[PDB]
Structure formats: C-alpha cells, structure tokens
Design a protein around this ligand. Structure first.
Ligand SMILES: CCn1nc(C#Cc2c(C)ccc3c(Nc4ccc(Cl)cc4)nccc23)c2c(N)ncnc21
Ligand SMILES: CCn1nc(C#Cc2c(C)ccc3c(Nc4ccc(Cl)cc4)nccc23)c2c(N)ncnc21
Lengths: 253, 274
C-alpha cells in the first residue's frame, strides 16, 4: 500500500453529515458516493496532525469486509480522510433509538460479523478503544462496518476506569453482546452517571443477565458472561470468541 | 514484503472452481474469504511474475465496486486472497438464470459498474476483458469487478487450448479485433466493453444471438459492418441510456466518451427516476 493521496479538487463535498472523532464529516462525490472527514482549521495542532497520521496509518493496513473501507486522504487543502459511503444506521440507532425488531438469527449474525472484524483488528496488533454500538454501522442493514465514529462509559472496563488492552476490547464486545441479546443498555435502572463509574470500577456493579431473551442461545449467553469477567486476564481471546460464535451460527443455517 | 499472510492462518475449504491461474477455494480467515492459489511445487518465472503483477495491481484498489483484495501468501504456494461474496455473476443472472430485474436495478448495476470502471481508469488501470461474467453481484445488490475468467491461449499444435477470452470476443472492440498488436487495448476499448454490458443489461440478451460462428463475428465486427441491434432494448429503457450505450459502442476508438462523462450521465439519469 503506497500513494493513497487524493489531489485537491477531485472530491465534491456535499451535505454536512455531522461531527466525527475530529473535525466534520460530509458526504462527497468521488467515483461514487464517499464520506469525507476533514479538519476545518487553517493550521493543525501537533496533537491534531499526529492523530490524523496515526489514524491514516492504521486505516491503510485494513482490508476486511467488517472494517470501514479506507480509500484515501488529502492534506494540501486541509487534513482529510476518505471512506466508503454506507447506507443504513448505526447499531445503537437500531437498538435504542429506533423500533427495529430484528430476528435472533440477525442478532447472532451481527455478533459474528463484529467478532470477525475485531479478530481481524487484533491480528493486526490494533487496539480499538471506545468500541460501542454507535461505532458499529449497518451497511444496507445487512453488513457490519466497524469504525471510530464521533457517554461511552457504558462499555468501559474496570481497568480503563482507574492502559487499554485487547481484554478491554473483549469486555466492550461483551457489552455489545449484552445490548444485542437483551435489547437495552446495561444499567437503565441506575440514574446517577457518576455513581455508575465508581460502582463499576470498584466492582460492585455488573450487568443484570436476567434481561436476556428466552430464545437467546445458551452458548451465546455463556460466552457473553465470560467476556464480561471482572478480571482482565480471565476473558478469552478473540480467536476463541469468533470460533464459538461461528460454531453457534453454523448450526442454524 | 507487506500484505503477506503467514502460512497456517487460512483454512482452505471446498473447491469453488478454476480462476485466471490455479484453483479457487473458499477459505476461513477471520471469516469467509476466497483463495486463488497455484498448485505447483516450484513456480515458474511466468507464474511468479503473473502473481506479482496481479498482486501489485490489486494492492492499489480500495473501492466498493472493485473486488476487495485482502492479502497474499507465498510460503505454501502462490496465492491471492479476496473477500467472499454471496450471489452470482451478472452473466448468470441474465443468460443462465434469466432473472428479470426491475429497470431501476438495471440502471443501478450500470451505475455501480461505471463507478468501478471510472475508479480503475483514474488509477491508470486498463481492465481488459470486461464482461457480465466479470461483474459479480454481491448479495445481488452490490457490484464487484474482478478478473474471474480465463484468457485465450492458442494451441501450440492444431485450434484453441484456452478460449474464454474468445468467449469475450463479443465484448471486444473493433480496433482490438483488427490488428491484435502489442496492447491494442485502451480506455476506449473498456468503454466499448461497458457499452456491450449496457446492451446486455437493457436488451437482456447477447449482441449477436442469431450469429453463432465466432469467425463470422470477428470478420464482420473488425471490418465494421456488424454492430448490436439496438431495437432489442426494452420499451421502458430510458432514452438517455440507449443514447449513452450507442455512444459507447462507436466503431471509431476516439469517438466514444471517457468514463468520467459516462459515470456522470448514468448518475444524472439514475437520480431522476428514484
Ligand atoms: C451517519 C454518519 N456517517 N459517518 C460516516 C463516516 C465516516 C468516517 C470517515 C469519513 C473517516 C474515518 C472514519 C473512521 N476512522 C477509522 C479509524 C480506525 C478504524 Cl480501525 C476504522 C475507521 N471511523 C469511522 C468513520 C469514519 C458515514 C459513512 N461512511 N456512510 C454513511 N453515514 C456516515
Ligand atoms: C466464481 C466463484 N468465486 N470466485 C471468487 C474469487 C476470486 C478471486 C481471487 C481469490 C483472487 C483474485 C481475483 C481476481 N483478480 C483480480 C485482478 C485484478 C483486478 Cl482489478 C481485480 C481482481 N479477479 C477475480 C476474482 C479473484 C469468489 C468470491 N470472492 N466470492 C464468491 N464466489 C467466488
């Protein structure tokens, strides 16, 4: 992978879609529909430039169906990152902001695609911090795309509260399994935001697994409980997680 | 030495078929993938050079309408890995399954193919042998462009050992047919191939159904007397679509529009019917 810079003037920026991890995200026209994440500043700060370079160097190493397709970047007009245009909404929107009623097979398949993406990233020695249902996009409502999109304490691990590792990502994936199988956020009953942080970091608070659906598979619930282990080094690696999820899904096709 | 996949990470599965070189299987590597490997003990200079050329061309592509290259392996054997797509080729849907899409779907397939081809032309990549067999319908909704078929190889002793690119003679342009010199292919020949694809999309059949002899097609098209019958287009086919298809099928090489203009026309057409 080399020479991925897009010259200025080739992209036609369109409607502003919102604010991303840094800068603003628009929909652009460049050999089809694309998404442009730009930094609307005249001169970027050292922090901004280093974050841009790190994110671009991480994106140029990814070629997987369940990872958002990086396509190029621009620096001459301003810092910009170009990705594929996806049709659909984030998993958080489907679960907690919309009334979409998925099938259990669809939930299992979403979990499997997310596990595939995360195992791919871990194979590249890439720790994805701030993993949540907002960061899992449903392309055409059928394909999972993982990315760092633009409150995230719900997925935070006890160690991160007190430093990021693969095990924190496994715990975040466990929380994702929780919101997939139950349908709601982990601690709805707890209302004080600061209380949740201290309680979970201390270790007294943990998700209520009675919220899982009756048709939720046994092995799926057991794996979700194993991924949400309070101890950092008690959680399985993502190869075993993907293997269990694939063995579960492959018996329903 | 980047993008190399270590040995043992991929679990090769059911043989899916024969690719451009070697054999193509479905494999397990962080999910479902497709592996095109060369089942030889020691590769020849030609085989290794072809592998390296294809890998170097694939490593420059990151587009939704181009088949996603994922990596390669060399320790067990020369192999190229791409994403696993569910569905069938456009040729299968049109002439082997006779699936009747809606006009919107035909327009959208043409639009996605135009996106992919304009992307490739922007990278100075001339994709020869563009046809409906080389256009895969991932989930029957997304276009993926790739080199799935075989090339034409003349038999050393008599008339053809390989003839799949002679199967693509239907999509060959008159200039490519005539002289067959060192690379008669151009961006305009790809434009003509895309025009033939538009023809089989809007009519539903191959350009020369009544003519069966390949030599007749060669002589007639190269001479300049033969061209697809555009009366076979459907009545609901847009006028602009037929006009663009006729402009892409111009007998002269330098009378056909470039793929930026083609993609612009197709996108402006599609955005007026949604
Ligand atoms: C609803 C609003 N919305 N936002 C879109 C976007 C975007 C992004 C852009 C432009 C650039 C970088 C991103 C990125 N970086 C990244 C870093 C590390 C790794 Cl491993 C993976 C990804 N993560 C996530 C997203 C982007 C978007 C779209 N593409 N289609 C439809 N709606 C969309
Ligand atoms: C018929 C059954 N079949 N065959 C699949 C495959 C494959 C390929 C592999 C493994 C490697 C290289 C390819 C390639 N090279 C290439 C060169 C230049 C350019 Cl620009 C673009 C592509 N062109 C086409 C395909 C492959 C396949 C799949 N991925 N999913 C489902 N069914 C499938």
């Amino acid at each position: 992978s080399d020479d991925w810079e897009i010259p200025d003037g080739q992209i036609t920026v369109g409607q502003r879609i919102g604010s991303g991890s840094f800068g603003t995200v628009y929909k652009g026209k460049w050999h089809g529909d694309v998404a442009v994440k730009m930094l609307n500043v005249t001169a970027p700060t050292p922090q901004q430039l280093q974050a841009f370079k790190n994110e671009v160097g991480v994106l140029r190493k990814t070629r997987h169906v369940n990872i958002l397709l990086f396509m190029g970047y621009s620096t001459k007009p301003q810092l910009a990152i170009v990705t594929q245009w996806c049709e659909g909404s984030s998993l958080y929107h489907h679960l907690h902001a919309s009334e979409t009623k998925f099938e259990m097979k669809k939930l299992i398949d979403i979990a499997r695609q997310t596990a595939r993406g995360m195992d791919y990233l871990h194979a590249k020695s890439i720790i994805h911090r701030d993993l949540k249902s907002n960061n899992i996009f449903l392309h055409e409502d059928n394909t999972v795309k993982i990315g760092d999109f633009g409150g995230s304490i719900l997925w935070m691990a006890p160690e991160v509260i007190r430093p990021y590792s693969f095990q924190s990502d496994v715990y975040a994936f466990g929380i994702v399994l929780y919101e997939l199988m139950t349908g709601q956020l982990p601690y709805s009953n707890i209302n004080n935001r600061d209380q949740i942080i201290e309680m979970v970091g201390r270790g007294s608070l943990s998700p209520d697994l009675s919220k899982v659906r009756s048709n939720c598979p046994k092995r799926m619930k057991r794996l979700m409980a194993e991924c949400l282990k309070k101890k950092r080094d008690e959680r399985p690696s993502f190869p075993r997680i993907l293997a269990e999820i694939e063995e579960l899904a492959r018996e329903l096709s």
